[PDB]
Amino acid sequence: GETLGEKWKKKLNQLSRKEFDLYKKSGITEVDRTEAKEGLKRGETTHHAVSRGSAKLQWFVERNMVIPEGRVIDLGCGRGGWSYYCAGLKKVTEVRGYTKGGPGHEEPVPMSTYGWNIVKLMSGKDVFYLPPEKCDTLLCDIGESSPSPTVEESRTIRVLKMVEPWLKNNQFCIKVLNPYMPTVIEHLERLQRKHGGMLVRNPLSRNSTHEMYWISNGTGNIVSSVNMVSRLLLNRFTMTHRRPTIEKDVDLGAGTR
């Protein structure tokens, strides 16, 4: 070492509460969740996204980086934002979600947004012990943050090792929590050389995370893009803070398919 990402991590861990809270939102895109969250409080089950995740995935999908189709397996679906988002797409026929749930984890939130009937969200499931099934689309947003870059390296590599057997010339969108550490990068290079795809940064991600996403469509230099992200996040430290770009939250409509 040390990578630019590790420097970013260093500096991040050196921030105070105020500096952190102003940095994490500085210059990023975020969707207005006011109405969605108020609606969810009133117990509404149409239109609303159960979390910020639906828009986060929509960013990828609208750019054709991942194109959900056929049977969609959403590992670690949590509340179900990605599953509920995919349920509305014409090419999607089945949505199957597994999440850990229980104490300390988000349960699947039952909704009646457009296409809910083709969605099955299952809790009490450790995806790491789940036998890989046949699917046309594989999603994965797993990766628990830590102040230690190395702990994150371990968790990340564990996630990649878990998801690889699910990949079969199919669409995928897979969260890479810590992409700047060297062993993760070699692993990703091997994975890319076997299954293709590219690492891309989602603009709705906060500056407080170096997370990138291994998506199935397109190609590129991984190390170059990771370091590109690193220099961006570093620049945003010294950049006069910019209030985030507020965008419309996704609307998931209503009805069965």
Side-chain angles (χ1 to χ4, degrees):
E2 70 178 10
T3 58
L4 296 81
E6 285 167 294
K7 291 187 185 306
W8 163 85
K9 195 64 160 149
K10 223 53 180 81
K11 303 251 227 133
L12 188 69
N13 277 339
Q14 288 173 314
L15 300 185
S16 75
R17 180 55 172 185
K18 179 164 174 70
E19 307 163 58
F20 185 83
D21 279 338
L22 287 177
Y23 170 67
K24 62 184 195 192
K25 294 273 203 73
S26 185
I28 75 173
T29 292
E30 75 172 2
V31 295
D32 193 330
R33 289 285 296 165
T34 304
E35 188 170 350
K37 309 205 141 279
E38 294 179 307
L40 288 172
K41 293 168 178 180
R42 319 160 210 174
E44 298 176 5
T45 47
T46 57
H47 295 283
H48 310 307
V50 299
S51 79
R52 296 181 163 278
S54 292
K56 185 153 181 209
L57 178 60
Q58 177 187 263
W59 191 86
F60 292 129
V61 176
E62 253 157 23
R63 281 137 182 94
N64 275 359
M65 297 163 172
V66 53
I67 302 168
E69 60 176 21
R71 187 181 182 231
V72 181
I73 296 284
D74 184 12
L75 300 180
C77 63
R79 294 182 204 165
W82 279 17
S83 283
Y84 284 140
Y85 173 71
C86 295
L89 309 174
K90 203 154 29 201
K91 301 179 61 188
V92 175
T93 57
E94 183 188 3
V95 179
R96 192 176 183 77
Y98 309 102
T99 204
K100 179 138 66 187
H105 292 296
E106 298 278 359
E107 294 285 344
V109 182
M111 293 293 283
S112 291
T113 45
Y114 182 61
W116 61 270
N117 49 310
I118 73 173
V119 173
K120 177 89 122 60
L121 307 172
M122 280 150 287
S123 184
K125 304 286 187 182
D126 196 4
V127 298
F128 290 90
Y129 301 161
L130 278 177
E133 309 162 12
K134 173 161 187 168
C135 68
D136 306 276
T137 302
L138 190 275
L139 308 179
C140 190
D141 198 31
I142 299 185
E144 195 191 337
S145 300
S146 171
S148 166
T150 53
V151 164
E152 291 187 337
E153 179 179 34
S154 295
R155 300 174 170 162
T156 301
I157 281 151
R158 174 190 180 196
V159 163
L160 295 172
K161 281 250 224 158
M162 179 269 291
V163 295
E164 195 281 335
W166 293 80
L167 306 186
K168 73 178 197 44
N169 305 288
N170 46 6
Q171 297 287 289
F172 59 77
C173 174
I174 296 151
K175 176 191 182 184
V176 179
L177 172 73
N178 191 319
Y180 52 76
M181 300 297 273
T183 72
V184 179
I185 276 178
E186 55 186 13
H187 216 97
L188 293 166
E189 286 177 345
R190 231 211 297 127
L191 294 178
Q192 189 190 36
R193 185 173 67 258
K194 172 178 198 198
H195 297 286
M198 180 53 188
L199 259 196
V200 185
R201 171 81 176 181
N202 194 307
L204 282 86
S205 296
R206 301 186 176 180
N207 303 323
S208 55
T209 172
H210 202 304
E211 71 185 9
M212 290 172 72
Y213 285 75
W214 185 25
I215 42 90
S216 48
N217 309 347
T219 190
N221 194 311
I222 286 186
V223 174
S224 176
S225 59
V226 173
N227 283 311
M228 262 194 205
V229 171
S230 296
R231 313 182 275 244
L232 170 73
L233 294 183
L234 281 176
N235 289 4
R236 289 184 177 185
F237 275 134
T238 53
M239 178 188 71
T240 306
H241 166 200
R242 298 161 144 75
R243 177 169 25 168
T245 299
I246 306 313
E247 289 166 5
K248 293 176 180 176
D249 192 8
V250 64
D251 190 288
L252 302 188
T256 61
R257 280 183 68 183

